[PDB]
Symmetry: D2
Subunit: 382 residues, 4 copies
C-alpha cells in the first residue's frame, strides 16, 4: 500500500468517526471510546512499530502527516493513538531482544496500547528528584511510588515506569510493567480541560512485583529523553493539524457570514488574519518535517541506540514542539474572537479547538523547561 | 452605610456564596441560580438605580469596585447582576413619566431583573439592518422578529427591544415589553462556553402587542449606544476582577510549588510575570475608574438625557472595554501555562477563568467593531486639527 | 496666567522651534542646542519648582500635559527640560533650608539645569553595590569614583551624586556638587541612538571636595527612589506624547496615500490599527494622570518628606513608566511598517520616533528591574491578605 | 571547490572586511564601498548565475547559507550582493539567447551589478497602475517615467525596467536598459534608516531609447513575480543571519555582565530569552531551506520557464520572507532592551541591527500585501 493510500484511509476514518461528533469527543466519556476500536480495524494501529515485530515500520516523517490528519479531526484522538511511540521506541532501542518479543509482538498483534509513567507531582520536571523506587528482590523487581499523569494506562497492555534505584540512589531505571501486575493501582482519571477524548491517569505502586528481565538497559532518565524525541515531534504535528482545522473553520464561517454587504471572506481584516494563519501553518509544517527527517536519518543508522545515548534530546524535536505549541495557540486565540457571540457558545467548535490546542505547550515539558534545555544544550556550548 | 462597608458586604457575599462553589457556577444549571435571590438579601440588587426611582443611586465609579469584587468570584454572576444597568438607564433617561412609574417604580422593591434585546443573527453588529420590526396599529405597537442573544430574559420582569419601524424609511425604536406579553417566546438558552452562571437566550416575537406609550423617546440605536456606556465600563471592571483573581491564584500556587529547591514565588521568571500582571491590573483599574468618573459627571448634569443624545458613545467607555478585555485575556493566556499539567485539569480554576474572561472582548461589540467606532468617532474628526497637520 | 494659556505657549514653542527641525535635533549637535535658551525665554524653565524658591510651583498633573506636548515635538527636548525634577525634588524635601536657598534659588532665577548621578557601570541597577564613595574630612566631604550616565551634567549648575560612605558599614548619601568643583571630570558624551537633542555624560570624581552641608538628609538610595517618582511619571508622559505624534503622522500619511482607489484613511486595516492606537493613547493618558494626581496629593501634605520616606517608590509611578514605555514602543513598532519603503528612509519621521520612544522602557530602570520591584513591594505583601 | 570551502571564504571575508567596521558600514558612504570590490576578488560575485553564462551555478539552498553568513556581518552588504538574482533570473528564463549573451556573459566576467526597477510612488504595490511607459518606434523601444526605489543602480551595468505599454495599456513589459543609456537619470540616493552599506536610488526616464530585442518575453508583472521568488527567499535568509548575530551579541554581553552575583548567562530570565531566540532561529533556518529546496527543484526542470509562468509566486518564498522578517524583528525588539542603558548608545551594535533587520518585512512587499497574496493564491482556491 502506498503512503498516499494510507493517508486516505486516515482521512476517511476522520470524516467517518470524528467530524461531527465533537459532542461525545469533548464529554470525557468512559474510556476507551469505541472509535479507537474503529481505528484498530483500519490496520494502522501502532503504525511505527518495526516490521521485525509485525508492525508496518512507518517513518516519523509519514507519522507527522498521519498525526496532522488525525488531529485535524480531534487532537485527543491523535494523542491517544501516537503517544505509545514514546514507550515502544524506548523498548525498541534499549530492551533486550526477548523483552522486545514479549511485549512488542503482542502489542501489534492485539492492536493494543502502552504507556510511559515518568511524571510525578513533587518532582515536577526536575526528574532527578523522582521518588518512585525500584528494588531488586531475588528474581523480581519491586516498584513503590505514585506517578502523576499517564495517558491510556487503564486500558494499556503494559507500561514503562521511570524509577530511581533504592539500591544506588544515583541510578535511574526504566521498568516494564504489565497492566495486571499485583500492586498496581489506577487511582483516578484526570478531568482534563481539553483533549477530552484522551484518558490520563494517576497510578500508584505498592509492592508491585515484576520479573527482573523487565528492566531496560541504561539510565532511565536518558532513555526517557530519547523516547520523548518522537512524541514531542508528533505533539507538534498535532498542533499543526488543529491549526489547519481552525483555518478551515474560519473559512467555512466566512463564506456565509455577511459584513459590509459582502461575505466575510471578501473582507480585508479577515483576509489578513487568514493569510497570516496560512503562513504560520506552512512554517509549522516545514519545521515538523525537518525534525522528523532528522529523527528518521538517525534511527536509520545501524548504531542508532548508541548514537542516541550520546545525543539525548534532539534539538529540532524540542524546537518543533515549542514553535508549534506557541503558534497554534496564537492562531486559536485570534480565532476565538473572530466568530462574534456565537463563537462564545458550544454551537461553534472554536472553543473546543482552543482548549485542545492548549495541551501542546504544556505536555512533555512546558516552554520554561524547554527554553532552558535548548539554552543549556545548544546555545551555551556553541 | 459607608461605601467601604457596602464593599465589605459584597466581599463577604463572594466569600460565602461563590468561592469554593465554582462547580455549580460552571454547570449551566437551571436558571436563575438561588444565589441571585441571596444577593438580593444584601439590599444591593439594582444598586445603581437612581434615588428618584427607589434605588440606592450608587455611582458608576462605586459600581466598578463592586463589579470587580463580584467578578473576582465569578464573572457570570457579576454580569448577571450589573447588566440590567443598560436597560434601566435607557428607560430612566428616555421613557415617559408614565412608563417609568409603571416599570422602574416597582423594580427595586421587587428585586427584579430586566433585559435589553438588541443583537440579531443576520444583522450582526450592523444594527441598521435589524429585521425585528415594530408596526403601529392605532394606539398599539406590534413587534415581530427574532432576537439572537439576551441575558436573563427568561426570568426578567420586562425587556427593552430594539426594533425597526415598518411604517418609516429608516426609523429605530426601543420598545418596553413585559415578560409575559402574549406573542413573546423564549426559544432557547445558549450553551455558552464561559460565564455559565449567566443565562442568555434567543427570543422571538409574533404579533406581540404593547401600548404605544411603551416606546422610549428617541432614535433607538442611539439610545442603545448610550445605554451601553455603563455596561461596557462594567464589563471592563469584570475583566479587571478576573485578572485580580488570576494573579491571586498564581500566588497561592507559587507559595507551595517548588522550583530549584525553593518556592516558586522566589523564582525570577515567576516574579517577572506577576510584576507585569500587577502593572496591567493597576492600569486597567485606573482606566475603568477614569471612564466611570466621566460617566458619573455627565449623568449628574441636569440635562443629562439631552447631553447624551449629542454625545452618544463615550470614548473612554469603549476604550476601557477594549483595553481590559484584551489585557485580561492576555493575563489568563499567560497563566494558563504557568501551572504545568495540573493547570490542564479541572483541579485548577485557570481553565474556567480563561473561558470566563474571554467574554469581555466579544460581547457588547468585538474589537473590530469597537476599533472602527473609536476611529470614526474620535480619530477622524480630531485629525483635522493636529499640530502636525 | 491660566493653565490653558501656559499650554498654548508650549504648543507654540513646539510648532516654532521643534517641528520641521528633525535633522538638527537628531544630529547630536553641540549641547545645549539653542532651542533650550529659546524655551528659557518663555519663562517656563523649571516650571515645577515651588514658589518659595521663585518658581511657578506647577503640579505634576500639569507637568504631564506640558511634557506630552513637548515630547510630541521631540522626546529628547522634553527629557532635557523635565529631568531636573528628579534633582530638585530630592533637594526640596531632604536638603537643609540653607542648601535649598544656595542651589534652588539661583537655579530658577538663572534658568539653569541640574542633574542626578546615580547609575554606574559595574553596579548596574544593583545600586547597593555602587563604588562611588564619600569620605568625611572634618567639615568637608570627599567624593571619588565614576558615574556612568547623567543627562545635561556638562552644562548643569550643580549635581546630586549618590555615593556610598567610606566611613560606615552600609550608608548611602546624596551629595550636592557644584559644576565647578575641582576634581569633577566629564569623561565623555554618550553617542545615544535616540533623544539626540539631549546630552548624557560619563562623569568621574577624584578627590572632589564639598562642604558637609551639601549632603542631603536621609538614606541616599531611598531619596533617589523618591526623586524618581516624578521623573518616571514624566518619562511615561513623554512616551504618550510620542505616541500621539505617531498617530498623527499616520493620519497625515493616510490622507494622501491611495489604496484600492481611495485614501488609505478609508481602509479597514488602517482604521483598525488607528482605532487600536487611540485606545492605547487614552489608556496611557489616564494612567499618567492618575499617577500624577496621586503624586500631587502626597506632595500637598505638610509632612510630605516624612510620608515619602515611608512610602518610597510610588506604585503608579512605576506602572505608568512600565505601561507607557511598552505601549508607545508597540505603537512605534507597528507604525514602522505602515509607510512602505518611504518609511525606511529619513523622508519620514517614524524611524526617529522609534529610536526616541525606545528610551522609555530602558531609562530609570528597565522592565526586568521594575517588574521585580513591583513584585517585591506590592504583590508579595498583599498576597498576605487576599480573599482567595 | 567544496561547498564548505566556499562558505569558509565567505566567513573569512566577513571577518576581514565587515566585522568591526560598523561605523563605515552604517554611514551611507560614497557608493559602492571598496569592500564590494574585495568580495569580487573572492571569485564569488554573482555566484548563482548558471554555468552557461560563465557563472558558478550555485543553487538557492547554498545561497541561503551564503547570505546568512554575509548578513551576520551586515545585512546591507548581503542585500547588495544577492539582490541581482532578481534581475538575472528574469533575463535567464525570459530573455532571448542574444540578450542573455549580451548582458549576462559580461556581468559574470566583469563582476558587475544589475538592478530591477519595479516600484513606483503612485502605484505602490498596485503594479497594474504603473505609469512608466514603453512605446514602440520602429525597431526600438522608448521609455518614459519615474521609478521610485532601485538598489545599486548608480553603479550597475544594466537594469530591467517594468513598464506599461503605451500602445496597449493592457500589456506590461520588462525592458533591459544599459546604465549609460541617454535619457536615464539617477535622481537621488535615498537616505535609508538601515542597510546603510547599500545604495538605493530614484530613477527617471525621458525619451530613453533601446533596441526592441532588449525586451523580455512575457507579461512583465508576471516575470517580476517570478524573479522575486529568489530575492524574497534570500531576504528571509538575511533576516536569519541578523538574528544569529543578535543571539551572539547577547551571549557576549551576558558573559561579562554581572547580575545577582553571577554572570548574566546564568540568569533564568536571560536563559529563557536566548532559548526562545534559538528555537526561532532553528525554525527560520528550516523554513528558508525548505523554500530554497522547492525553488531549486523547480528551476532544475527542463521546462522551468514555462512551469514558472504557470506558478508565479512560490508559496514558501512568500511565507519565508513573511515569517523571517517578523521573527527577526521580534528578536531584535526584545534584545534592544536587554543591554540596559549602554544598549541605547552606539557603543553597542543592537541599535544598528534593529534598523538593519527592519527592512525584511518592508521590502519586496510588506506583510499587508503578502498576507493578501497568500490568502488569494493559497487559501481561497483550496475549497
Ligand atoms: C493530558 C495530559 C497527558 C499527559 C501528561 C499530562 C497531561 C495534563 N503528562 C505529564 C506532562 O507531560 C507534564 O505535566 C508536563 O511535562 C509538565 O510537568 P509538570 O506538570 O510536572 O509541571 P512543571 O513542574 O514542569 O512546571 C510547572 C510550572 O512551574 C514553572 N516552572 C517549571 N519549570 C520552570 C523553569 N525551568 N523555569 C521557570 N519556571 C518553571 C512554570 O510556571 C511551569 O508552568 C504525562 N506524563 C507521563 O509521564 N506520561 C504521560 O503519558 C503523560 N501524558
Ligand atoms: C453570553 C452572551 C451574552 C450576551 C450576548 C452574547 C453572549 C455570547 N449579547 C450579544 C453580543 O453582545 C454580541 O454577540 C456581540 O456584540 C457581537 O455581535 P455579533 O455576535 O452579531 O457578531 P459580529 O457580527 O459583530 O462579529 C462577528 C465577526 O465578524 C467580524 N467582524 C465584525 N465586524 C467587523 C468589522 N467592522 N471589521 C472587520 N471584521 C468584523 C469579526 O470576525 C467578528 O468576530 C447580548 N445582546 C443583547 O442584545 N442583549 C444582551 O443581553 C446580550 N448579552
Ligand atoms: C540617554 C540616557 C540618559 C540617562 C541614562 C541613560 C541613558 C541611556 N541614565 C542611566 C539609566 O537610567 C540606566 O541606564 C537604566 O536605569 C538601566 O540601568 P543599567 O544601564 O545599569 O542596566 P541594568 O544593569 O539595570 O540592566 C541591564 C540588563 O541586565 C538585565 N537585567 C537587569 N536587571 C535584571 C533583573 N532584575 N532580572 C533579569 N534581568 C535583569 C537585563 O537584560 C537588562 O537589560 C541616567 N542615570 C543617572 O544616574 N542620571 C541620569 O540623568 C540618567 N539619564
Ligand atoms: C532600501 C530599499 C531597497 C529597495 C526598495 C525599497 C527600499 C526602501 N524597493 C522598493 C520596495 O520593495 C517597496 O518599497 C516595497 O515593496 C513596498 O512598496 P511601497 O513602498 O510602494 O508601499 P505600499 O504601497 O506597498 O504600502 C505602503 C502602506 O500602505 C498600506 N498597504 C499597502 N497595501 C495594503 C494592503 N493590501 N492592505 C492594507 N494596507 C496596505 C500599508 O500601511 C503599507 O505599509 C525596491 N524596488 C525595486 O523596484 N527595485 C529594488 O531594487 C528595490 N530595493
Amino acid at each position: 500500500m502506498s503512503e498516499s493510500e494510507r493517508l486516505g484511509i486516515v482521512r476517511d476514518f476522520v470524516a467517518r468517526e470524528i467530524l461531527g461528533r465533537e459532542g461525545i469527543l469533548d464529554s470525557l466519556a468512559d474510556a476507551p471510546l469505541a472509535l479507537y476500536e474503529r481505528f484498530a480495524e483500519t490496520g494502522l494501529m501502532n503504525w511505527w512499530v518495526p516490521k521485525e515485530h509485525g508492525g508496518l515500520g512507518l517513518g516519523l516523517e509519514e507519522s507527522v502527516r498521519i498525526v496532522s490528519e488525525l488531529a485535524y479531526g480531534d487532537a485527543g484522538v491523535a494523542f491517544t493513538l501516537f503517544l505509545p511511540v514514546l514507550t515502544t521506541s524506548m523498548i525498541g532501542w534499549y530492551g533486550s531482544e526477548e523483552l522486545k518479543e514479549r511485549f512488542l509482538g503482542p502489542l501489534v498483534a492485539r492492536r493494543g496500547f502502552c504507556a510511559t509513567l515518568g511524571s510525578e507531582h513533587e518532582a515536577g520536571s526536575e526528574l532527578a528528584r523522582i521518588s518512585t523506587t525500584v528494588r531488586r528482590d531475588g528474581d523480581t523487581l519491586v516498584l513503590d511510588g505514585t506517578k502523576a499523569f499517564s495517558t491510556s494506562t487503564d486500558f494499556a497492555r503494559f507500561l514503562v515506569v521511570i524509577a530511581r534505584s533504592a539500591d544506588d540512589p544515583a541510578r535511574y531505571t526504566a521498568v516494564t510493567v504489565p497492566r495486571d501486575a499485583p500492586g498496581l493501582r489506577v487511582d483516578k482519571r484526570w478531568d482534563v480541560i481539553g483533549m477530552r477524548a484522551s484518558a490520563t491517569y494517576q497510578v500508584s505502586f505498592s509492592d508491585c512485583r515484576v520479573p527482573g528481565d523487565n528492566a531496560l538497559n541504561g539510565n532511565g532518565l536518558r532513555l526517557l529523553e530519547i523516547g520523548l524525541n518522537a512524541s514531542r515531534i508528533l505533539i507538534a504535528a498535532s498542533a499543526l493539524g488543529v491549526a489547519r482545522r481552525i483555518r478551515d473553520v474560519c473559512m467555512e464561517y466566512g463564506k456565509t457570514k455577511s459584513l459590509k454587504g459582502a461575505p466575510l471572506v471578501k473582507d480585508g481584516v479577515f483576509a489578513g488574519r487568514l493569510g497570516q494563519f496560512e503562513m504560520q501553518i506552512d512554517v509549522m509544517a516545514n519545521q515538523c518535517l525537518a525534525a522528523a527527517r532528522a529523527y528518521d536519518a538517525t534511527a536509520a543508522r545501524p548504531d542508532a541506540a548508541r548514537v542516541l545515548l550520546r545525543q539525548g534530546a534532539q534539538k529540532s524535536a524540542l524546537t518543533a514542539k515549542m514553535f508549534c505549541g506557541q503558534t497554534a495557540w496564537q492562531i486559536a486565540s485570534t480565532a476565538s474572537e473572530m466568530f462574534g457571540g456565537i463563537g462564545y457558545t458550544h454551537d461553534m467548535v472554536i472553543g473546543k479547538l482552543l482548549r485542545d490546542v492548549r495541551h501542546a505547550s504544556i505536555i512533555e515539558g512546558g516552554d520554561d523547561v524547554l527554553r532552558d534545555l535548548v539554552y543549556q544544550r545548544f546555545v551555551v556550548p556553541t
